Design a protein around this ligand. Structure first.
Ligand SMILES: *[C@@H]1O[C@H](CO)[C@@H](O)[C@H](O)[C@H]1NC(C)=O
Ligand SMILES: *[C@@H]1O[C@H](CO)[C@@H](O)[C@H](O)[C@H]1NC(C)=O
Ligand SMILES: *[C@@H]1O[C@H](CO)[C@@H](O)[C@H](O)[C@H]1NC(C)=O
Lengths: 51, 505
């Protein structure tokens, strides 16, 4: 992966056109997104008052 | 260069016509056989037409005779890693009441896992159990459903090419040149067709040479680093785990990616062992440094010395000491070919101006012949003892060929003819004799050895005592007188020495 919607990600020597690529992503509050492939999730209820 | 071992098996076997107005040919089909030749020779195939006086030839060039094997199968084995994940979803429904998979549900993907990718590959999605309570993540004393998916990856992308074989039949290279002008090369096998090029189906024959340490060997090679090795490899898809033969795929394009549709794995290639909602996967796939002895390019097992010969469609070779095999003849087949014949040959005459070489030995005696004619390559030399045919050019040039002689002083009169006109030539010169070279350290055999002339192994009385005399009676008398004088002097010296040793002790 070199560029995502006109955003520089890595340093490559040959560019091309955008291509559909299935990949997961998540936001943490920064500008750009973070894509990941190997991740372990855990669902906790905690009986919070927000639910 | 030179040529020998003529056949002329199907002379005058054409059914042509006027030839498009002036002269042409239609077809020349038959069957012939070429005997064994030494590495670095040419086997000419001269045709004879009933109408045309002369025709062209077909030279067969052999450079190396290496010990290779056949190609039973071909596949690529990529490198794999250990990747896995897990989840800790709560039941919260009637899905994880007692058991997560009712009887056979293995597709544990609720449209959320990362398995639907092009870089993941394929694997086995299992399930596990969890605990209950405030510390376990839920609010019910009941086990939870924990699903896990494991898959292999290949970050680097090392590609290997393995080709199992258990024949190891002799083979060689052939640089064939057609009489029309096309020159190509191909690698024939011991009894296997060599992709016949417009009728010519010359094959190579062996002598059923025995082996000593060739039982389970393959030709596994590497593509990126171009590293070779010799080690017992696996068999076709039906294999056993414990040695080479890990997850394969269809082709080289399917080797960088471990996706499905071409990749085949049997069972028990990746282990999983979880303790508490972790699902950590350990590696059990053996690397390259886990197989048996795993010989490399430098191999000296027995008399065979396996090397890496730079060649197409094959990178495995090897050459033991001089074997001097019995027969290595070929089998040339004909299906269809034509050659343009002019039938307009005119007067031509040549002569001999140089003669040199060895005795009846490996390289032979090279004799250069000079000719002059108006056509391009209308010539055919025939003489007693040996027959040699070659090609010339238009005009006057120099051409060097080699012949086989069985006499020290080569002084005879051969007949030379270029097409239809014939003439006479003569040879006069001095030749030498060279024996079979010996073995020396630092030098190893490259391809093979065919044969060495070791029949006579005796000095001929005619050639000997020739340069010492030249007159012969005078020389013999002088040598005898000198020998007698030297013998008398040495006897007198010995008598004086014995007299000095006896007395004055
Ligand atoms: C190489 O394989 C094993 C590895 O130790 C060894 O015992 C054997 O003698 C070697 N040669 C073979 C199998 O030809
Ligand atoms: C014959 O061979 C010798 C040795 O190379 C060479 O000097 C001489 O020119 C040759 N003669 C002809 C006629 O080719
Ligand atoms: C003879 O050989 C020369 C080599 O260049 C070739 O050009 C020519 O066409 C050939 N045939 C002739 C001269 O009839």
């Amino acid at each position: 992966i070199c560029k995502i919607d006109g955003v520089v990600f890595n340093q490559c020597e040959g560019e091309s056109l955008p291509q559909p690529f299935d990949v997961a992503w998540m936001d943490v509050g920064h500008s750009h997104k973070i894509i990941m492939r190997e991740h372990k999730t855990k669902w906790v209820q905690e009986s919070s008052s927000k639910d | 260069e030179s040529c020998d071992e003529m056949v002329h098996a199907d002379s005058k076997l054409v059914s042509c016509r006027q030839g498009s107005g002036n002269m042409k040919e239609c077809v020349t089909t038959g069957r012939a056989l070429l005997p064994a030749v030494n590495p670095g020779q040419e086997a000419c195939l001269h045709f004879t037409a009933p109408g045309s006086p002369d025709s062209k030839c077909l030279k067969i060039k052999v450079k190396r005779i290496n010990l290779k094997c056949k190609k039973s199968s071909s596949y690529f084995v990529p490198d794999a890693r250990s990747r896995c994940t897990s989840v800790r979803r709560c039941r919260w429904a009637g899905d994880c009441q007692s058991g997560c998979p009712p009887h056979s549900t293995s597709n544990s993907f609720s449209d959320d896992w990362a398995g639907k990718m092009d870089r993941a590959g394929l694997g086995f999605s299992g399930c596990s159990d969890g605990c209950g309570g405030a510390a376990c993540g839920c609010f019910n004393a009941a086990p939870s459903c924990i699903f896990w998916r494991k898959w292999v990856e290949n970050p680097h992308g090392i590609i290997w090419k393995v080709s199992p074989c258990a024949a190891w039949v002799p083979s060689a290279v052939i640089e064939l040149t057609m009489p029309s002008g096309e020159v190509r090369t191909f690698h024939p096998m011991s009894g296997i067709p060599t992709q016949v090029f417009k009728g010519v189906s010359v094959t190579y024959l062996g002598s059923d040479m025995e082996v000593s340490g060739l039982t389970d060997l393959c030709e596994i090679e590497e593509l990126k680093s171009k590293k070779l090795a010799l080690a017992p490899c696996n068999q076709a898809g039906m294999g056993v785990v414990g040695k080479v033969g890990e997850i394969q795929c269809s082709s080289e394009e399917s080797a960088r990616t471990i996706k499905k549709d071409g990749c085949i794995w049997n069972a028990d290639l990746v282990g999983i062992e979880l303790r508490v909602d972790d699902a950590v996967c350990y590696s059990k796939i053996t690397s390259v440094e886990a197989v048996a002895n795993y010989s490399a390019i430098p191999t000296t097992i027995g008399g065979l010395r396996f090397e890496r010969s730079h060649d197409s469609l094959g990178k495995i070779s090897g050459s033991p000491l001089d074997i001097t095999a019995i027969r290595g003849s070929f089998s040339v087949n004909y299906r269809g070919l034509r050659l343009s014949l002019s039938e307009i040959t005119a007067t031509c005459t040549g002569e001999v101006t140089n003669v040199s070489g060895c005795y009846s030995c490996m390289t032979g005696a090279k004799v250069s012949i000079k000719l002059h004619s108006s056509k391009n390559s209308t010539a055919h030399v025939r003489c007693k003892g040996d027959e040699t045919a070659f090609s010339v050019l238009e005009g006057v040039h120099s051409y060097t060929v080699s012949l086989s002689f069985d006499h020290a002083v080569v002084d005879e009169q051969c007949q030379l003819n270029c097409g239809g006109h014939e003439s006479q030539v003569t040879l006069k010169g001095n030749l030498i004799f060279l024996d079979v070279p010996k073995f020396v350290d630092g030098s190893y055999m490259q391809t093979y050895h065919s044969s060495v002339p070791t029949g006579a192994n005796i000095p001929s009385p005619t050639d000997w005592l020739n340069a010492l005399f030249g007159r012969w009676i005078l020389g013999v008398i002088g040598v005898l007188l000198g020998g007698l004088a030297l013998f008398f002097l040495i006897m007198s010296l010995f008598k004086l020495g014995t007299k000095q040793v006896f007395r004055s002790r």
